[PDB]
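sry for the spam today, last one i promise. C-alpha cells for design, 377 residues
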C-alpha cells in the first residue's frame, strides 16, 4: 500500500483532495475526499475558480444518463447532468471502473476561490445519494466491479499545505501506533456512530447521552470542525471556558465570530483542556475513547490579511444536524471505514500534531451501560 501513502493534499480549512482520472483518454482532476456525502460530482464547465474541469466531449467512454441533479444547501447549490464514464485513481488501486459522474454545470458558493480541487468524491452510502439511492456511489461501483476489498482508510495530517493518505482496499500499519478500536456503523447512510460519553479534561458533561447523538453523530472528512449539538455545545464550551479561566476571551471567539491571537511561539496549549469522546464499542456494555488536543480544535489562521502573528480559530461549533466529527477529530487518528464489517476503527495517527506534554489517544475497554439508549430514533 506504499503507492497510496501521501496521495492526499490540501490547504487548511479547504479539505483534502486526491488525484483522479475520468474519461478516455484520462482527464486528471483533483477531487475533494468527502465521507459525509455520496455523490461523485465534478466541475464540467469553465467556472473562473477552477484549474480544470471535465470535458465530456473529449471522452469516447462517456455515456449520458439524460437526467439532471439539483443539489441545494443553505448558503448555495450545485447542479449537473448525470452520466457514467471510466474512472481511475493514479495513486490508488491499479484498476479502472465505470462510475456515475455528476457533471457540474452551475453552482453557488460550492467551489473555493484559490483552491486546487474541481470535484467531490462522496464516500458515504446510496441512501443519501442525490437525486436518490438508485444512483450507485463510486465506492460501491469500485467494489462491485473489482476485487478491491470493501474498506478504505484515511490519515489526514494537517501539516499552508496539509497532506495525508487515503488507503483504498486496506489498512497500512505504518500510518498508526497502538491498536485500532472499532465502533459500529449504526446505519449505512452517513457514517453514523454513537457517542456514549463526553469528557473535558477528564471531567464528564453528565448529560443524557442521547443529546450527544441528536439527531445524528457522523464521521465527516468534508467538514473542518468538531460540530456538537447546541445543548452539548453550550455545555462543552461552558466547561472548556471554565477549564480555561487562566486567560479571558470574547464570547464571539467561542462562537467562531472572531479569532484569538498570541505572539509567535507563545500559544498556551496547556490552559486548554483535552476533549474525550467515548464511542460505542463492538461489545455489549463496552466502549472506548478518543482524546484530542487543543492543537486539533484551535486551528491556525495565518490566512488573516490584517495581521502577522499566531492567530487561531475555535474549531468547535454548534450544529442543527447532529455531531460531526470533522477534520478536528480525524487529524488525531488513523480512521478505518470498514464497510465489510459495518464499523469504523480509530487508532492514534503516526502523523498527528502534539506537544511534549500531552498526546492524542485511543483507549479501551471501558464499561458503559445503556449505550443503545444514546442513539436517536
Ligand atoms: N461532508 C458534508 N457534510 C455536511 C454537509 C454536506 C457535506 N458534503 C456535501 C457538500 C460539501 C460542500 C463543501 C464545499 C467546500 C468544502 C471545502 C472543504 N469541505 C467542503 C465541503 C458544500 C456543500 C455540500 O452540500 C452539497 C452536496 C450535497 C450532497 C452531495 C454533494 N454535495
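last one done:
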Amino acid at each position: 500500500f506504499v503507492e497510496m501513502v501521501d496521495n492526499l493534499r490540501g490547504k487548511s480549512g479547504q479539505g483534502y483532495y486526491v488525484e483522479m482520472t475520468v474519461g478516455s483518454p484520462p482527464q486528471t482532476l483533483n477531487i475533494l475526499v468527502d465521507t459525509g456525502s455520496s455523490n461523485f460530482a465534478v466541475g464540467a464547465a469553465p467556472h473562473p475558480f477552477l484549474h480544470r474541469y471535465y470535458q465530456r466531449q473529449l471522452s469516447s467512454t462517456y455515456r449520458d444518463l439524460r437526467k439532471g441533479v439539483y443539489v441545494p444547501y443553505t448558503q448555495g447549490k450545485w447542479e449537473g447532468e448525470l452520466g457514467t464514464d471510466l474512472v481511475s485513481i493514479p495513486h490508488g488501486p491499479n484498476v479502472t471502473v465505470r462510475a456515475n459522474i455528476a457533471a457540474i454545470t452551475e453552482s453557488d458558493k460550492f467551489f473555493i476561490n484559490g483552491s486546487n480541487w474541481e470535484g467531490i468524491l462522496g464516500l458515504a452510502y446510496a441512501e443519501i445519494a442525490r437525486p436518490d439511492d438508485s444512483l450507485e456511489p463510486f465506492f460501491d461501483s469500485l467494489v462491485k466491479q473489482t476485487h478491491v476489498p470493501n474498506l478504505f482508510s484515511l490519515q489526514l495530517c494537517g501539516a499552508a499545505s496539509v497532506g495525508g493518505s487515503m488507503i483504498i482496499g486496506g489498512i497500512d500499519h505504518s500510518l498508526y501506533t497502538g491498536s485500532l478500536w472499532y465502533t459500529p456503523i449504526r446505519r449505512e447512510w452517513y457514517y453514523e456512530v454513537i457517542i456514549v460519553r463526553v469528557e473535558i479534561n477528564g471531567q464528564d458533561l453528565k448529560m443524557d447521552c442521547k443529546e450527544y447523538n441528536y439527531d445524528k453523530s457522523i464521521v465527516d472528512s468534508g467538514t473542518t470542525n468538531l460540530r456538537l449539538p447546541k445543548k452539548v455545545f453550550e455545555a462543552a464550551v461552558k466547561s472548556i471556558k471554565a477549564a480555561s479561566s487562566t486567560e479571558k476571551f470574547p464570547d464571539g471567539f467561542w462562537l467562531g465570530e472572531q479569532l484569538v491571537c498570541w505572539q509567535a511561539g507563545t500559544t498556551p496549549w496547556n490552559i486548554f483542556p483535552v476533549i474525550s469522546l467515548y464511542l460505542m464499542g463492538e461489545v455489549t456494555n463496552q466502549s472506548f475513547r478518543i482524546t484530542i488536543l487543543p492543537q486539533q480544535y484551535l486551528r491556525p489562521v495565518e490566512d488573516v490579511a490584517t495581521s502577522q502573528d499566531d492567530c487561531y480559530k475555535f474549531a468547535i461549533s454548534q450544529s442543527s444536524t447532529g455531531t460531526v466529527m470533522g477534520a478536528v477529530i480525524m487529524e488525531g487518528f488513523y480512521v478505518v471505514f470498514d464497510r465489510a464489517r459495518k464499523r469504523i476503527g480509530f487508532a492514534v495517527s503516526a502523523c498527528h500534531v502534539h506537544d511534549e506534554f500531552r498526546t492524542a489517544a485511543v483507549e479501551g475497554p471501558f464499561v458503559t451501560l445503556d449505550m443503545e439508549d444514546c442513539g436517536y430514533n
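The chain has five helices and 25 strands. ok im logging off now
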